[PDB]
Amino acid sequence: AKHPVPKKKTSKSKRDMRRSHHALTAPNLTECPQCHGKKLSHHICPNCGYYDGRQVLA
Amino acid sequence: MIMPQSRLDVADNSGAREIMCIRVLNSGIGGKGLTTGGGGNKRYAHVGDIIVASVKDAAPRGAVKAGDVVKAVVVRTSHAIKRADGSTIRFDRNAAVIINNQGEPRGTRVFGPVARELRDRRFMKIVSLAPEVL
Amino acid sequence: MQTHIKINRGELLRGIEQDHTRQLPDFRPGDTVRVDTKVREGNRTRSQAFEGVVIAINGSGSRKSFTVRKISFGEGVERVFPFASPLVNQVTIVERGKVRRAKLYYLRELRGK
Amino acid sequence: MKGILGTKIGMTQIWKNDRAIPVTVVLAGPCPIVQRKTAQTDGYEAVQIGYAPKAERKVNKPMQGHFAKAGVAPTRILREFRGFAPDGDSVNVDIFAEGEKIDATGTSKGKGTQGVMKRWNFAGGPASHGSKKWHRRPGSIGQRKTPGRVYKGKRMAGHMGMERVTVQNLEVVEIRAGENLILVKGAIPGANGGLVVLRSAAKASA
Amino acid sequence: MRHGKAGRKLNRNSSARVALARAQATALLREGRIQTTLTKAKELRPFVEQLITTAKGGDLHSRRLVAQDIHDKDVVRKVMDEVAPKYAERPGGYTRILRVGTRRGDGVTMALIELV
RNA sequence: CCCCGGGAGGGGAGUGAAAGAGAACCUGAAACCGUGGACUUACAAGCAGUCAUGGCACCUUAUGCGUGUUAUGGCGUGCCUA
RNA sequence: GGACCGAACCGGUGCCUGCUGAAACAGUCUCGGAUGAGUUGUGUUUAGGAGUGAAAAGCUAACCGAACCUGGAGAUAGCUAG
RNA sequence: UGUCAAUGCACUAAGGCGCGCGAGAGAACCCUCGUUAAGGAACUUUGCAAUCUCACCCCGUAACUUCGGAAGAAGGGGUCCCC
RNA sequence: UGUCUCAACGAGGGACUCGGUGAAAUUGAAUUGGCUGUAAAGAUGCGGCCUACCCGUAGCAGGACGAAAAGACCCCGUGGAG
RNA sequence: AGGUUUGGCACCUCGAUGUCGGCUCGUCGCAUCCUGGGGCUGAAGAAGGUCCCAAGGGUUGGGCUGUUCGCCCAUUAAAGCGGCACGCGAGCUGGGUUCAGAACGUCGUGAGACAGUUCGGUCUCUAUCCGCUACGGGCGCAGGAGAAUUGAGGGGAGUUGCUCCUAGUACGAGAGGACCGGAGUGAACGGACCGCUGGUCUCCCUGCUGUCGUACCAACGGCACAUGCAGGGUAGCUAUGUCCGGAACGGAUAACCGCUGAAAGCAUCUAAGCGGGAAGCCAGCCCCAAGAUGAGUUCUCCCACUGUUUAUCAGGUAAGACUCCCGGAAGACCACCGGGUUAAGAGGCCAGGCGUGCACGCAUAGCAAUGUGUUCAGCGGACUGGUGCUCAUCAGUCGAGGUCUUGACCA
Numbered sequence A: 001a002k003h004p005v006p007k008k009k010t011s012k013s014k015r016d017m018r019r020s021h022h023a024l025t026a027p028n029l030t031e032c033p034q035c036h037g038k039k040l041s042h043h044i045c046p047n048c049g050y051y052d053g054r055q056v057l058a
Numbered sequence B: 001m002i003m004p005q006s007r008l009d010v011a012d013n014s015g016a017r018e019i020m021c022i023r024v025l026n027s028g029i030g031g032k033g034l035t036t037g038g039g040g041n042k043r044y045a046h047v048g049d050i051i052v053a054s055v056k057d058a059a060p061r062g063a064v065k066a067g068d069v070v071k072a073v074v075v076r077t078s079h080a081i082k083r084a085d086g087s088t089i090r091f092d093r094n095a096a097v098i099i100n101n102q103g104e105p106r107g108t109r110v111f112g113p114v115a116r117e118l119r120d121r122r123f124m125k126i127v128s129l130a131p132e133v134l
Numbered sequence C: 001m002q003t004h005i006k007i008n009r010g011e012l013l014r015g016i017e018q019d020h021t022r023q024l025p026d027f028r029p030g031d032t033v034r035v036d037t038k039v040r041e042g043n044r045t046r047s048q049a050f051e052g053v054v055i056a057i058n059g060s061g062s063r064k065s066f067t068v069r070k071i072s073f074g075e076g077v078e079r080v081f082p083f084a085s086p087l088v089n090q091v092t093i094v095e096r097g098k099v100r101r102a103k104l105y106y107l108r109e110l111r112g113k
Numbered sequence D: 001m002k003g004i005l006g007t008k009i010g011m012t013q014i015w016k017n018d019r020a021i022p023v024t025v026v027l028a029g030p031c032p033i034v035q036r037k038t039a040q041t042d043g044y045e046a047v048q049i050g051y052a053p054k055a056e057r058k059v060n061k062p063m064q065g066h067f068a069k070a071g072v073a074p075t076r077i078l079r080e081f082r083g084f085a086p087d088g089d090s091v092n093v094d095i096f097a098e099g100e101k102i103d104a105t106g107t108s109k110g111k112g113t114q115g116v117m118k119r120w121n122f123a124g125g126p127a128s129h130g131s132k133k134w135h136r137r138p139g140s141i142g143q144r145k146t147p148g149r150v151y152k153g154k155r156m157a158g159h160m161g162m163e164r165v166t167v168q169n170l171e172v173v174e175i176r177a178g179e180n181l182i183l184v185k186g187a188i189p190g191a192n193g194g195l196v197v198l199r200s201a202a203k204a205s206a
Numbered sequence E: 001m002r003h004g005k006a007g008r009k010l011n012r013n014s015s016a017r018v019a020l021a022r023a024q025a026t027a028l029l030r031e032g033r034i035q036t037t038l039t040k041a042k043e044l045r046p047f048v049e050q051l052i053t054t055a056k057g058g059d060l061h062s063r064r065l066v067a068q069d070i071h072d073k074d075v076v077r078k079v080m081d082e083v084a085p086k087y088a089e090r091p092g093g094y095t096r097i098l099r100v101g102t103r104r105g106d107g108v109t110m111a112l113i114e115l116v
Numbered sequence F: 001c002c003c004c005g006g007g008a009g010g011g012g013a014g015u016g017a018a019a020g021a022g023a024a025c026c027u028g029a030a031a032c033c034g035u036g037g038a039c040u041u042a043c044a045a046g047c048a049g050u051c052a053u054g055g056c057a058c059c060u061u062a063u064g065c066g067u068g069u070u071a072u073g074g075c076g077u078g079c080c081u082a
Numbered sequence G: 001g002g003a004c005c006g007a008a009c010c011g012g013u014g015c016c017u018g019c020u021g022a023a024a025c026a027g028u029c030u031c032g033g034a035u036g037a038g039u040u041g042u043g044u045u046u047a048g049g050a051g052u053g054a055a056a057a058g059c060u061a062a063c064c065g066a067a068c069c070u071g072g073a074g075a076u077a078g079c080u081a082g
Numbered sequence H: 001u002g003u004c005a006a007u008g009c010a011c012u013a014a015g016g017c018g019c020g021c022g023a024g025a026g027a028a029c030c031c032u033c034g035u036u037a038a039g040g041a042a043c044u045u046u047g048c049a050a051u052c053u054c055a056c057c058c059c060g061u062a063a064c065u066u067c068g069g070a071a072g073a074a075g076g077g078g079u080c081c082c083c
Numbered sequence I: 001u002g003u004c005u006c007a008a009c010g011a012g013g014g015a016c017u018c019g020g021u022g023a024a025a026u027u028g029a030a031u032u033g034g035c036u037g038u039a040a041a042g043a044u045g046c047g048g049c050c051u052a053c054c055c056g057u058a059g060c061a062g063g064a065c066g067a068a069a070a071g072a073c074c075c076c077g078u079g080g081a082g
Numbered sequence J: 001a002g003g004u005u006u007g008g009c010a011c012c013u014c015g016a017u018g019u020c021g022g023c024u025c026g027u028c029g030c031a032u033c034c035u036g037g038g039g040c041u042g043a044a045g046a047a048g049g050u051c052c053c054a055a056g057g058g059u060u061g062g063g064c065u066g067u068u069c070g071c072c073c074a075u076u077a078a079a080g081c082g083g084c085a086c087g088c089g090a091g092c093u094g095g096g097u098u099c100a101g102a103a104c105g106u107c108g109u110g111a112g113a114c115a116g117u118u119c120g121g122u123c124u125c126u127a128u129c130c131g132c133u134a135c136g137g138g139c140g141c142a143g144g145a146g147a148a149u150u151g152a153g154g155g156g157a158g159u160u161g162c163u164c165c166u167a168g169u170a171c172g173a174g175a176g177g178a179c180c181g182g183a184g185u186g187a188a189c190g191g192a193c194c195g196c197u198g199g200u201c202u203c204c205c206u207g208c209u210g211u212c213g214u215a216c217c218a219a220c221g222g223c224a225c226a227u228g229c230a231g232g233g234u235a236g237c238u239a240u241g242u243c244c245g246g247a248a249c250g251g252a253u254a255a256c257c258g259c260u261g262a263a264a265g266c267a268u269c270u271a272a273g274c275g276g277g278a279a280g281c282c283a284g285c286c287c288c289a290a291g292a293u294g295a296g297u298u299c300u301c302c303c304a305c306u307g308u309u310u311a312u313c314a315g316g317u318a319a320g321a322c323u324c325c326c327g328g329a330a331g332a333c334c335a336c337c338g339g340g341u342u343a344a345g346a347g348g349c350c351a352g353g354c355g356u357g358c359a360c361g362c363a364u365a366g367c368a369a370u371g372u373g374u375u376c377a378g379c380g381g382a383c384u385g386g387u388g389c390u391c392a393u394c395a396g397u398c399g400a401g402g403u404c405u406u407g408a409c410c411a
Ligand SMILES: CC[C@H]1OC(=O)/C=C/[C@H](C)[C@@H](O[C@@H]2O[C@H](C)C[C@H](N(C)C)[C@H]2O)[C@@H](C)C[C@@H](C)C(=O)/C=C/[C@H]2O[C@@H]2[C@]1(O)CO[C@@H]1O[C@H](C)[C@@H](O)[C@@H](OC)[C@H]1OC
Pocket: A001, G019, G024, G025, I068, I069, J016, J018, J122, J124
């Protein structure tokens, strides 16, 4: 079979024990200064296309 | 960097054409003759070091036949030998000179240049026989 | 961790190094005589000379060096001189060479005429 | 005893009476006395000296008031020196004498996660005759059940470099005092532009 | 280890690294601006900047140099007689990048690179 | 019929005793996965329980009465087969 | 010409790699034969103590000192489990 | 197309494809590779493995032999462009 | 001639990080340390003493008499077959 | 006495505890091979013998053999003996013996056999827990922050030769030939470093072949590897290359050597007491370290905000961080360091350095292959500065109001 193999099934507790580290981070979203929608920082406001002026269509 | 197994050329008329080294010693010529060794572990022969060696090839009409074990001092490394001013030397082929247990050469003469470092380690007669102490 | 002093380490190195830098006749891969001093023979200051082809030049400042290759009694020899080594008197251009590459080690295994 | 701070500038070729000398150039730029540690107040004797300057726009208020109480411009770097009792500010001038031996402390260049051959000189297995242990790969780590653990302090793959390091009894070749340059024989730990401490040779010779 | 670096392997061999940077320089020059992965844009920036600086010399040598990398004759023509001359009094900085969020399929973040 | 959705899915409206039957259509146990809440745990050695006591919480076979949880002390070598 | 070198083709020498494989026998490299006791297609004949076999107890539909399927048959089990 | 020849090798025509996860990073270690100072089998059970050799011309070629052979023995030289 | 003294540097494909899809063998249950001692005679789990805050990620293979096949050796069966 | 040999016995393991040797990696005992200290000697010196103390470190490279051993070569201060499942196969070999083939010798009428001998012969990508090496996240450390730090404790290190001075002295008829102290130079080992000497440097520069292409020529690009081949080669990384190290001093000890000294009117190192005394012990050297929950110390910063008995603790903020962006001699991720417009962080651009080695184009010489000039040219990854040309926009998240007791000082 499979040289290394695990010994006892891991506990419902210890399994969720390891998982205390998989929580996602929410984006630090910010209010776009022209389109009045939300945008990622140091990127281009998807809603209006603006980046001080305006680079992308729509 | 001579080490055991590596074959040298002989710079004397002692009658060997070329030896193969089999040990690497410490080799103070030292008023009573050659010293006893300076530790059993040294790995590499440099210019000026003494080595033990089998005589793998020899002159017909020799003073020194094939298969003699012998002690030769090394006088030409392909390895760079650096010096106190900054300069380096290096010869196209490695070569040695067979010598007796008081250090003196066994041939009547040396052949090719010899490193100035032989003069450093008090190898008087080898230095004296050689055409150029480079 | 590392200091961030505003500093031209270029010129700090240059000041040090220029105190021990020395300029020589302009050779360039064709042969010459290096006349030089062996204080090394006793307390006396013997002189000796190496005439050979220049097969490379390396570095700059303190570190610049050049490489001569000759033949002495059958066995080939090469030597490496720092331009600023005190054990070097004068170089002089014996000859001028029509070589075609900066380094020209091909003469290691050419040895002939 | 004597101490000072500087940046590692590089290594070059030199001469002194026809001996070629590798040297490391160091900037022992003038250091300021930010703090004085009496035993009577801080329980032991020492001096807090600073090194690389930085503009007060980058210096937060607590560090600002630290430097300010001592009357000094802000310094990117601070360190203590045990048993020093300098005066005024600690310039490399005369603090080292030409030809002194000195303890040079620096920080090893960071080599990341090295294997066993790089890290501990293992010399792992043969490259032919038939393995899949060719590279590093230590051989054993124990001996069957006999204690049945692997020893504490075992030598193993790890983070190599980035260590503090001291190299003792390097010689002081030269001192260009007005430049605040100190020329020292041989190598010093860590990469160019890094911090280094020169102090009086701790293991002074007999 | 890696304490001095020319850029990136991307995940490609010496031959490709080149063929890419060449093609992408060709497209940004033909097209004024293009979007691609933020990486490949950061890698593109200096190749194309230097290319325009080569063509900025005008003589046949600089054109043949540019021909070494931009193997499409019209783009080389445009860069030689149109774009480089325009960049006359501009000391580098011929190029800019701005980043435009993340892609669906591989969840990679694209950005645009465009002539200045 | 209406709402969000490309859809899938759902929320209303309406039929029906019932949609706590809606077509993944009687009941719908357990393992197994989740949400919320009580009491709790980051100096700690453990067949996981058991006895004892304090703390906290709740009162529908239920205010001396417990029930749930918990801290600390004592004690304590899974089951079966062979 | 049971001659030589060597592609196709037939093969399988040594090493590595693969070893819950890309693959229940393989891949790259290397290597043997390569006008012959040669290679290969279609049709067809020989089988279970039986066939075949330049001979290993090999092969006989992916594990042959006696194939598979069904049946006697819930064989018998001084043995182990429960 | 090139190369004594060729269905060989290299690039390519017609034609067909980039192998149905992708992007970065440039640690240990593992696979498949390139180079390597001085030394040259000291490795090891064994030169296992990997080098070295390499095509075609020319000269040259041993013991031994069933007189065919050993033999591509061994070894040395040439090889490009132009008139 | 990197087989070796004695290993270095570089390449690519993995290994690592992010987004998509997502197995396996194994698993009495686990709140699963070291020494020494004792125990069916090689102790995480008994005794004494030491050490030790909670939880992960990349890695190594000494233990878990690690995993796989109700040992092919050996003996036994008034077992079998060639 | 030990428990490392051959054995007895048969206790766990036959629903498996893989066995010889090598390699790799270690670590322990001491009944000590070397070094260190001592007694005695049939110890003059030197060279030894043997016993006592001592386990810090050290203990070589080859030939033969599967070998372990052992013999040999050539060295050595020495080439120690054993434990650790005869340590170590989920770490590697697979040479050895325990499968199938085949052969010899032998035994058996045979099928087959072995104390044997010989050629051949599948060693299983994914670590759950513990143990180990590295790296983060959390909470704690009675306010919230930025730095500097004591060192409880813990780790590393620890070898040794040769020569020279003492001194041709003490000693010895002589030959010979010292201790003690003082210098110097090596080996092996380790740490750091890249100036030197070198390695490499997968597209930094050049040369070269075939073939395909940019119409052609000239000039270039692709493929020939995952660099087509070759010749060089900066930064980086690197050893074979450099530099540094092992200690000095000190405290308590071992064998042992003594002072003072009774019992025991003498003697006695011991019975009270005291000094000397090792590579060993403690400290000294380097590194780690307050999760030393016994959580330490010092300098500095910010300060008493707000909400009706209803939401009772939370919420705007300070000092200060963090997200994000551009980078790094930092790095798997994380972490760490630097910059982010009151800006030289990176790219680019300029200048320089360094590498390659004389560009294209034109002219010219020549029948031509080519040569020469223009030209130390041309081109240029990672190197040193400068420079606001590009991007480091704009912004969002988070973060104090300091429990109680007792004692002293204060108004
Ligand atoms: C590694 C290759 C194969 O294993 C072995 O050879 C051997 C594995 C073990 C070590 C061995 O155990 C040992 O037995 C001893 C008697 C006792 C010993 N004790 C002391 C522990 C024990 O350790 C065996 C009997 C264990 C048992 C589970 C078993 O029978 C396993 C069978 C097969 O899966 C394995 C393979 O991995 C399959 O590899 C195949 O190789 C072919 C060439 C390929 O074509 C391919 O076939 C399509 C591939 O797959 C099938």
